[PDB]
Design a protein around this ligand. Sequence first.
Ligand SMILES: [Cl-]
Ligand SMILES: [Cl-]
Ligand SMILES: [Cl-]
Ligand SMILES: [Cl-]
Ligand SMILES: [Cl-]
Ligand SMILES: [Cl-]
Ligand SMILES: [Cl-]
Ligand SMILES: [Cl-]
Ligand SMILES: [Cl-]
Ligand SMILES: [Cl-]
Ligand SMILES: [Cl-]
Ligand SMILES: [Cl-]
Ligand SMILES: [Cl-]
Ligand SMILES: [Cl-]
Ligand SMILES: [Cl-]
Ligand SMILES: [Cl-]
Ligand SMILES: [Cl-]
Ligand SMILES: [Cl-]
Ligand SMILES: [Cl-]
Ligand SMILES: [Cl-]
Ligand SMILES: [Cl-]
Ligand SMILES: [Cl-]
Ligand SMILES: [Cl-]
Ligand SMILES: [Cl-]
Ligand SMILES: [Cl-]
Ligand SMILES: [Cl-]
Ligand SMILES: [Cl-]
Ligand SMILES: [Cl-]
Ligand SMILES: [Cl-]
Ligand SMILES: [Cl-]
Ligand SMILES: [Cl-]
Ligand SMILES: [Cl-]
Ligand SMILES: [Cl-]
Ligand SMILES: [Cl-]
Ligand SMILES: [Cl-]
Ligand SMILES: [Cl-]
Ligand SMILES: [Cl-]
Ligand SMILES: [Cl-]
Ligand SMILES: [Cl-]
Ligand SMILES: [Cl-]
Ligand SMILES: [Cl-]
Ligand SMILES: [Cl-]
Ligand SMILES: [Cl-]
Ligand SMILES: [Cl-]
Ligand SMILES: [Fe+3]
Ligand SMILES: [Fe+3]
Ligand SMILES: [Fe+3]
Ligand SMILES: [Fe+3]
Ligand SMILES: [Fe+3]
Ligand SMILES: [Fe+3]
Ligand SMILES: [Fe+3]
Ligand SMILES: [Fe+3]
Ligand SMILES: [Fe+3]
Ligand SMILES: [Fe+3]
Ligand SMILES: [Fe+3]
Ligand SMILES: [Fe+3]
Ligand SMILES: [Fe+3]
Ligand SMILES: [Fe+3]
Ligand SMILES: [Fe+3]
Ligand SMILES: [Fe+3]
Ligand SMILES: [Fe+3]
Ligand SMILES: [Fe+3]
Ligand SMILES: [Fe+3]
Ligand SMILES: [Fe+3]
Ligand SMILES: [Fe+3]
Ligand SMILES: [Fe+3]
Ligand SMILES: [Fe+3]
Ligand SMILES: [Fe+3]
Ligand SMILES: [Mg+2]
Ligand SMILES: [Mg+2]
Ligand SMILES: [Mg+2]
Ligand SMILES: [Mg+2]
Ligand SMILES: [Mg+2]
Ligand SMILES: [Mg+2]
Ligand SMILES: [Mg+2]
Ligand SMILES: [Mg+2]
Ligand SMILES: [Mg+2]
Ligand SMILES: [Mg+2]
Ligand SMILES: [Mg+2]
Ligand SMILES: [Mg+2]
Ligand SMILES: [Mg+2]
Ligand SMILES: [Mg+2]
Ligand SMILES: [Mg+2]
Ligand SMILES: [Mg+2]
Ligand SMILES: [Mg+2]
Ligand SMILES: [Mg+2]
Ligand SMILES: [Mg+2]
Ligand SMILES: [Mg+2]
Ligand SMILES: [Mg+2]
Ligand SMILES: [Mg+2]
Ligand SMILES: [Mg+2]
Ligand SMILES: [Mg+2]
Ligand SMILES: [Mg+2]
Ligand SMILES: [Mg+2]
Ligand SMILES: [Mg+2]
Ligand SMILES: [Mg+2]
Ligand SMILES: [Mg+2]
Ligand SMILES: [Mg+2]
Ligand SMILES: [Mg+2]
Ligand SMILES: [Mg+2]
Ligand SMILES: [Mg+2]
Ligand SMILES: [Mg+2]
Ligand SMILES: [Mg+2]
Ligand SMILES: [Mg+2]
Ligand SMILES: [Mg+2]
Ligand SMILES: [Mg+2]
Ligand SMILES: [Mg+2]
Ligand SMILES: [Mg+2]
Ligand SMILES: [Mg+2]
Ligand SMILES: [Mg+2]
Ligand SMILES: [Mg+2]
Ligand SMILES: [Mg+2]
Ligand SMILES: [Mg+2]
Ligand SMILES: [Mg+2]
Ligand SMILES: [Mg+2]
Ligand SMILES: [Mg+2]
Ligand SMILES: [Mg+2]
Ligand SMILES: [Mg+2]
Ligand SMILES: [Mg+2]
Ligand SMILES: [Mg+2]
Ligand SMILES: [Mg+2]
Ligand SMILES: [Mg+2]
Ligand SMILES: [Mg+2]
Ligand SMILES: [Mg+2]
Lengths: 166, 166, 166, 166, 166, 166, 166
Amino acid sequence: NFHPDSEAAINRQINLELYASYVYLSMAYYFSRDDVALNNFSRYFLHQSREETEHAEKLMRLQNQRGGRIRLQDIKKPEQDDWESGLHAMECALLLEKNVNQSLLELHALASDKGDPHLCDFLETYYLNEQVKSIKELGDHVHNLVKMGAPDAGLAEYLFDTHTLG
Amino acid sequence: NFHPDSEAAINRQINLELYASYVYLSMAYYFSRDDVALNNFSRYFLHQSREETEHAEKLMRLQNQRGGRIRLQDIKKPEQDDWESGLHAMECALLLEKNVNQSLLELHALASDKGDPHLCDFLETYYLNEQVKSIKELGDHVHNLVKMGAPDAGLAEYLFDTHTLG
Amino acid sequence: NFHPDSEAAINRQINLELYASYVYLSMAYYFSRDDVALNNFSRYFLHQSREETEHAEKLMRLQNQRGGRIRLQDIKKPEQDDWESGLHAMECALLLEKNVNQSLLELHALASDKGDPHLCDFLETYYLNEQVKSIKELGDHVHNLVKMGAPDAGLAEYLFDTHTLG
Amino acid sequence: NFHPDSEAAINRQINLELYASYVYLSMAYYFSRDDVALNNFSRYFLHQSREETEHAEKLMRLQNQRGGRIRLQDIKKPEQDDWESGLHAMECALLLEKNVNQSLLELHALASDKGDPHLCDFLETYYLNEQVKSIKELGDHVHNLVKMGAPDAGLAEYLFDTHTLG
Amino acid sequence: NFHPDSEAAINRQINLELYASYVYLSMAYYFSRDDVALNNFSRYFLHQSREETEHAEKLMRLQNQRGGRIRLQDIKKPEQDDWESGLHAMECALLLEKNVNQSLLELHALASDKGDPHLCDFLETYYLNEQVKSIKELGDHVHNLVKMGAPDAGLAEYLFDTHTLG
Amino acid sequence: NFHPDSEAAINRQINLELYASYVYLSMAYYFSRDDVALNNFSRYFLHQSREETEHAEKLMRLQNQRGGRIRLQDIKKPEQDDWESGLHAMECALLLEKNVNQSLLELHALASDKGDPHLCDFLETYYLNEQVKSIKELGDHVHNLVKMGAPDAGLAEYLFDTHTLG
Amino acid sequence: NFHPDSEAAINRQINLELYASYVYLSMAYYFSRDDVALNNFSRYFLHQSREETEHAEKLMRLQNQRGGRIRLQDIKKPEQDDWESGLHAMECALLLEKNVNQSLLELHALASDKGDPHLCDFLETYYLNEQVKSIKELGDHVHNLVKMGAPDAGLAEYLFDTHTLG
Ligand SMILES: [Cl-]
Ligand SMILES: [Cl-]
Ligand SMILES: [Cl-]
Ligand SMILES: [Cl-]
Ligand SMILES: [Cl-]
Ligand SMILES: [Cl-]
Ligand SMILES: [Cl-]
Ligand SMILES: [Cl-]
Ligand SMILES: [Cl-]
Ligand SMILES: [Cl-]
Ligand SMILES: [Cl-]
Ligand SMILES: [Cl-]
Ligand SMILES: [Cl-]
Ligand SMILES: [Cl-]
Ligand SMILES: [Cl-]
Ligand SMILES: [Cl-]
Ligand SMILES: [Cl-]
Ligand SMILES: [Cl-]
Ligand SMILES: [Cl-]
Ligand SMILES: [Cl-]
Ligand SMILES: [Cl-]
Ligand SMILES: [Cl-]
Ligand SMILES: [Cl-]
Ligand SMILES: [Cl-]
Ligand SMILES: [Cl-]
Ligand SMILES: [Cl-]
Ligand SMILES: [Cl-]
Ligand SMILES: [Cl-]
Ligand SMILES: [Cl-]
Ligand SMILES: [Cl-]
Ligand SMILES: [Cl-]
Ligand SMILES: [Cl-]
Ligand SMILES: [Cl-]
Ligand SMILES: [Cl-]
Ligand SMILES: [Cl-]
Ligand SMILES: [Cl-]
Ligand SMILES: [Cl-]
Ligand SMILES: [Cl-]
Ligand SMILES: [Cl-]
Ligand SMILES: [Cl-]
Ligand SMILES: [Cl-]
Ligand SMILES: [Cl-]
Ligand SMILES: [Cl-]
Ligand SMILES: [Cl-]
Ligand SMILES: [Fe+3]
Ligand SMILES: [Fe+3]
Ligand SMILES: [Fe+3]
Ligand SMILES: [Fe+3]
Ligand SMILES: [Fe+3]
Ligand SMILES: [Fe+3]
Ligand SMILES: [Fe+3]
Ligand SMILES: [Fe+3]
Ligand SMILES: [Fe+3]
Ligand SMILES: [Fe+3]
Ligand SMILES: [Fe+3]
Ligand SMILES: [Fe+3]
Ligand SMILES: [Fe+3]
Ligand SMILES: [Fe+3]
Ligand SMILES: [Fe+3]
Ligand SMILES: [Fe+3]
Ligand SMILES: [Fe+3]
Ligand SMILES: [Fe+3]
Ligand SMILES: [Fe+3]
Ligand SMILES: [Fe+3]
Ligand SMILES: [Fe+3]
Ligand SMILES: [Fe+3]
Ligand SMILES: [Fe+3]
Ligand SMILES: [Fe+3]
Ligand SMILES: [Mg+2]
Ligand SMILES: [Mg+2]
Ligand SMILES: [Mg+2]
Ligand SMILES: [Mg+2]
Ligand SMILES: [Mg+2]
Ligand SMILES: [Mg+2]
Ligand SMILES: [Mg+2]
Ligand SMILES: [Mg+2]
Ligand SMILES: [Mg+2]
Ligand SMILES: [Mg+2]
Ligand SMILES: [Mg+2]
Ligand SMILES: [Mg+2]
Ligand SMILES: [Mg+2]
Ligand SMILES: [Mg+2]
Ligand SMILES: [Mg+2]
Ligand SMILES: [Mg+2]
Ligand SMILES: [Mg+2]
Ligand SMILES: [Mg+2]
Ligand SMILES: [Mg+2]
Ligand SMILES: [Mg+2]
Ligand SMILES: [Mg+2]
Ligand SMILES: [Mg+2]
Ligand SMILES: [Mg+2]
Ligand SMILES: [Mg+2]
Ligand SMILES: [Mg+2]
Ligand SMILES: [Mg+2]
Ligand SMILES: [Mg+2]
Ligand SMILES: [Mg+2]
Ligand SMILES: [Mg+2]
Ligand SMILES: [Mg+2]
Ligand SMILES: [Mg+2]
Ligand SMILES: [Mg+2]
Ligand SMILES: [Mg+2]
Ligand SMILES: [Mg+2]
Ligand SMILES: [Mg+2]
Ligand SMILES: [Mg+2]
Ligand SMILES: [Mg+2]
Ligand SMILES: [Mg+2]
Ligand SMILES: [Mg+2]
Ligand SMILES: [Mg+2]
Ligand SMILES: [Mg+2]
Ligand SMILES: [Mg+2]
Ligand SMILES: [Mg+2]
Ligand SMILES: [Mg+2]
Ligand SMILES: [Mg+2]
Ligand SMILES: [Mg+2]
Ligand SMILES: [Mg+2]
Ligand SMILES: [Mg+2]
Ligand SMILES: [Mg+2]
Ligand SMILES: [Mg+2]
Ligand SMILES: [Mg+2]
Ligand SMILES: [Mg+2]
Ligand SMILES: [Mg+2]
Ligand SMILES: [Mg+2]
Ligand SMILES: [Mg+2]
Ligand SMILES: [Mg+2]
């Protein structure tokens, strides 16, 4: 029981998860630049990158298990190589995770229309809550950074780096 | 002491390592397809993918350490999604690793011309021998698979999967 | 296989490493002054001093191993006894390490011209990367200190001392 | 109690054992070639090489203990550098070990004629049975390889490599 | 990327390392003669012999890894069977190691001309420093033995044997 | 309670301790020369060098604790780079330690005149007895070396190196 | 299967082994004399005495096992009570062990003539090699002692006692 629009949509989500992994990887190595040097922001985003790779692998295994055929696409480069500040990176990540969430919600609605409860359950089990938690955590971080005066307050990002992300 | 052609070439190698990671990832999930089902070929290529990601990260850290600026590019999709057979995948990997090697050798020669012994040493230390070992190992595997009659001999790939890659 | 210009240059590097050790020692005891009292800056620079002594000893052992004759020179005093601030000391260290690096690069180029691959390898193995890492780390520290408002912001150096150098 | 023909014959056996060591070393590195890649054949022959070196050292110690003078000779190269197949190498080894055995039997007969029971006992204790066991084991291996269809059956040597020599 | 002059030169070095192994083996069993009986000189040279065999095996593995073909030659006998004294053996070893070093330096220069950085790095990593250390250690031993009055001073070699080589 | 002549004198002693450290370092690497090769003399003098660095650091901490200002000077090179023999080095060290002792005694007398019991106690606690013990130990060593016939007796320094300094 | 000449010859060897035990016992207590005082020579010879007693007991058990009748004889006193020097004792022991060896070889030849392979094997297993090793070891010791200048060099025997026999 597996539709072609479903196979295709899963393949599209695979690519999106790999893109998310790459964005986070880009931010991780931005924050270990010599003129940024926020080593816990770096570690934070590196860990998120690795999570996103696992998100992609889970969908690839789903595709294999349902007898679909994985069709990989180019992984697009992140839209910035200078992420400007710890606050700006967090805000960009929050938007990324909200766009990923809405793609997952779209995929869920497609699965519901197709009467594919196995795909709905897979998404609900592995993706939808983790996305909500991600979105909440990034939102938390953005709020704290703004309240502390980032990015122009000289100490906000340094102190956020050593305590919250430490 | 860091040239712009050098920075650029390192960025090009970063992208190539990420491409290699993606090729191996593609082969890993080909071999767990229901009409392939060579689970040790899958594990083998998955491990190689993860190594290639580390190869890319080491160059990104080098770029940061030398004060260069990482400039990421799209990661191109692998040229096949059906890798046809365990032998064909191994042959395709051997070619990939030889092309990666020749790009690394080109980068080494650029570094030598630029009088950048730190970059030469980095490459020699982390890349050139691992590439030779990789190339040798894949060559070993290709030879064994051909000698056993792959891919048309029904038992060659199954038995290679359970013993050599087990 | 060992040239006299090579022996001489190694002796010059020995002296430079011992000078670097002395500079760091001077900064270590500046920061435990009663009107400075940044005890983790002190510990940081003391550790760097001890590393530099080991850098000098490794070259002395190289000289002995190659059958050269160690010729020691006066170790010059550091150019300041009041290092003014945690930021100023870090900036002065970064410059010192860049000058040491360029002396090591000069020695490497001399060894290459002399066809002395043992000396090239020794330098590449023990010196060139450690210098790049040092330079990067000091650069990181300088950037963080400036961003936090050092030296005139009353809390920047205190907080850098307790977190980054803690 | 030690004859000159005896001293000379022991010296000749020393050289023969060292030759055997070298043959096995040659076969070990043949089987780790990229177009052979039988890593357990390689390990097997490498272990035999090391045994043969010990066989030579025991006779050198005997020579020293009896007050004879060790007179070393050139160690001849093995007669092939391409050993052609796992079966052909095993057959060549069996012949080598039979020729070594017959040289040891000749030495034993010389010792018996000379009334040198210490040399007879040394040979019987350390050499003659190990040779018979070697010859039997190689014969076992040759028989199994032929029965399985080596070298032209694509799987015989691979499977012998992974099970018998694993 | 592997030249025929390179393959040939590596094969020549293999043979030279095996020759060095044999020289040391010859000296080891000289010093356990009943009219020499310097059992720590014996152990010392025996250990050096085993190291040299490993030096040869590393180059054989390099040859296999680069896709070259190992071509073994006769291993020549050492030029003496009576090494005359502990001092004379040490002096002969120092010369051997200097000749081996110069052959390795020649091979390095060949690799540099051929633009083969993998071979340069292999040599620098595994051979050139060990040779310098060897040469220094043997030189140390020769100097101590001469200063103590060897070989004609009845106690020099005995005492060197029990303390330095003990 | 801290005089300017006192601050100055402590600074002069700091420099003298650092000079002593450097002399010992010079002797340590003399005795690991290939034409000296007395590795326990080397270790002995290396340990003394490290002690002298600690002697200097203790006075720097004293200066900081009393609110004085450390003023570092050039560290002069040792007066010899060829220390000639194990006996000559020991004799030169004994003289160095006696000159350091007399400088410490001078500093103590200055402190007594200034009514600075904290400085007197510091010196008595950390310096004066260690100096007497040092002087006695070096004197012991010199006496033994002369009695054994150093430096011209071929075995005196070798045997002193392996037993007393072992 | 046991001849009377064989029984008799074994009885003669028993007595010879007991004589050897007594000689060594005599030398052991010579070297603990107050005007000799070489306590490791003493321990060495005492251990050899105990070995010789075991050599005699093994032949007595052989005699009992073969159904022969042990016929003991007087144990003659050693031919000296003043063994003169550590070198002279070692030389006297070497001669004793060579005479014991030749008696054992004579017994072996008798057994061979009598077609008594059990007695030949007993001798070869327990006696002939131990004798060769003994003879070699004593020869080693004699050579070292002469080379060091014994007995007239005041330090040769003392130093041999503390190192070789320690
Ligand atoms: Cl899967
Ligand atoms: Cl695409
Ligand atoms: Cl950008
Ligand atoms: Cl911003
Ligand atoms: Cl923003
Ligand atoms: Cl900020
Ligand atoms: Cl980094
Ligand atoms: Cl791009
Ligand atoms: Cl395809
Ligand atoms: Cl295929
Ligand atoms: Cl194909
Ligand atoms: Cl197949
Ligand atoms: Cl199995
Ligand atoms: Cl050294
Ligand atoms: Cl100077
Ligand atoms: Cl100043
Ligand atoms: Cl400042
Ligand atoms: Cl400044
Ligand atoms: Cl501040
Ligand atoms: Cl031996
Ligand atoms: Cl020959
Ligand atoms: Cl051939
Ligand atoms: Cl064949
Ligand atoms: Cl054949
Ligand atoms: Cl086969
Ligand atoms: Cl290999
Ligand atoms: Cl040849
Ligand atoms: Cl000779
Ligand atoms: Cl000589
Ligand atoms: Cl000579
Ligand atoms: Cl001697
Ligand atoms: Cl302090
Ligand atoms: Cl000054
Ligand atoms: Cl001098
Ligand atoms: Cl002198
Ligand atoms: Cl003097
Ligand atoms: Cl001396
Ligand atoms: Cl019994
Ligand atoms: Cl009687
Ligand atoms: Cl007597
Ligand atoms: Cl005598
Ligand atoms: Cl005598
Ligand atoms: Cl004596
Ligand atoms: Cl001693
Ligand atoms: Fe996680
Ligand atoms: Fe995700
Ligand atoms: Fe996400
Ligand atoms: Fe791995
Ligand atoms: Fe790679
Ligand atoms: Fe690769
Ligand atoms: Fe460190
Ligand atoms: Fe340094
Ligand atoms: Fe440094
Ligand atoms: Fe805190
Ligand atoms: Fe074995
Ligand atoms: Fe053998
Ligand atoms: Fe054999
Ligand atoms: Fe199996
Ligand atoms: Fe070793
Ligand atoms: Fe070697
Ligand atoms: Fe060597
Ligand atoms: Fe100490
Ligand atoms: Fe001192
Ligand atoms: Fe001192
Ligand atoms: Fe001793
Ligand atoms: Fe015993
Ligand atoms: Fe006996
Ligand atoms: Fe005996
Ligand atoms: Mg994709
Ligand atoms: Mg996360
Ligand atoms: Mg793009
Ligand atoms: Mg873009
Ligand atoms: Mg539902
Ligand atoms: Mg549900
Ligand atoms: Mg979830
Ligand atoms: Mg996330
Ligand atoms: Mg937060
Ligand atoms: Mg890229
Ligand atoms: Mg791999
Ligand atoms: Mg594309
Ligand atoms: Mg394509
Ligand atoms: Mg290198
Ligand atoms: Mg590598
Ligand atoms: Mg690989
Ligand atoms: Mg294989
Ligand atoms: Mg200097
Ligand atoms: Mg450091
Ligand atoms: Mg100055
Ligand atoms: Mg100045
Ligand atoms: Mg380094
Ligand atoms: Mg540093
Ligand atoms: Mg920092
Ligand atoms: Mg020979
Ligand atoms: Mg064997
Ligand atoms: Mg030949
Ligand atoms: Mg031939
Ligand atoms: Mg046997
Ligand atoms: Mg064998
Ligand atoms: Mg078999
Ligand atoms: Mg050869
Ligand atoms: Mg060695
Ligand atoms: Mg020859
Ligand atoms: Mg010759
Ligand atoms: Mg190089
Ligand atoms: Mg290099
Ligand atoms: Mg090396
Ligand atoms: Mg060596
Ligand atoms: Mg020495
Ligand atoms: Mg000073
Ligand atoms: Mg001391
Ligand atoms: Mg001066
Ligand atoms: Mg001077
Ligand atoms: Mg007191
Ligand atoms: Mg004291
Ligand atoms: Mg001292
Ligand atoms: Mg003393
Ligand atoms: Mg009796
Ligand atoms: Mg014994
Ligand atoms: Mg009597
Ligand atoms: Mg008598
Ligand atoms: Mg037997
Ligand atoms: Mg025996
Ligand atoms: Mg005995
Ligand atoms: Mg001895």
